[PDB]
Structure 1
Amino acid sequence: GPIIENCAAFIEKTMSKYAITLSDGTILKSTIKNETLKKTFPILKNLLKDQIPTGSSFFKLPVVFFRVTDNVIVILLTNEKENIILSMFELFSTQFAEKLALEYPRTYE
């Protein structure tokens, strides 16, 4: 929906290679090639167990993951400095995390 288009435009201000995915592997938007993105998912699936809590990030350069909400992951391919990337993630979360959390909630019962 509109929230994903707005998220994508925000990232694309500075990053041309990104994806927005759900924690189960569903691709919501991507400028990363499909085959490349598919190959990174096993890394993400294993890291989601105990290495990336909601709100945290993980750097495996050039791949960067940001778990903005329980179910929504931002993926970048980047060689930008860490602090530049984290500043963008912080502003992204401020703008979008509340809407994303209701759009893609996780079942607890």
Structure 2
Amino acid sequence: GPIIENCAAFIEKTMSKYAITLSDGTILKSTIKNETLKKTFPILKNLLKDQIPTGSSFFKLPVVFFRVTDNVIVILLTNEKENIILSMFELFSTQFAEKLALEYPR
């Protein structure tokens, strides 16, 4: 049926703490608490102007950003090893970045 509830179960299969957000600040789904997201989003909007091209990730552990689509960003709080996180993102995209760009176009 509806994605987002599908994206979150995917992510939770390997990370407890995440958020699926849009570029303006809209949280579509999040297990990260509001206090952390409020201080986190201004940093993400900055990097979004030219440091995270669509399809790329950005690391500052425990925070990680993945621009799945042009408008949709995944935010992780994790200490997983790098290759696991990149692997999660690669799979998440190839199973979701089509449906997600279709449901949340810019």
Query: Where on the TM-score scale, by shorter chain, does this alignment land: which range?
Result: over 0.9
Number of the residue aligned with 2:73: 73
TM-score with structure 2 length normalisation? 0.97
Q: CA deviation at 1:2?
A: 1.5
- Structure 2, unaligned runs of 5 or more: none
TM-score with structure 1 length normalisation? 0.95
User: How many residues are aligned here?
Assistant: 106
- Structure 1, unaligned runs of 5 or more: none
Q: CA deviation at 1:35?
A: 1.0
Q: CA deviation at 1:38?
A: 1.1
Q: CA deviation at 1:104?
A: 1.1
1:75-97 Cα offsets, whole Å, 9 max, x none, are 00011111110000000001000
Distance across 1 between alignment mates of 2:21 and 2:38: 11
1:46-94 Cα offsets, whole Å, 9 max, x none, are 0000000100000011100000001000000011111110000000001
- RMSD, aligned α-carbons: 0.9
Distance across 1 between alignment mates of 2:33 and 2:104: 24
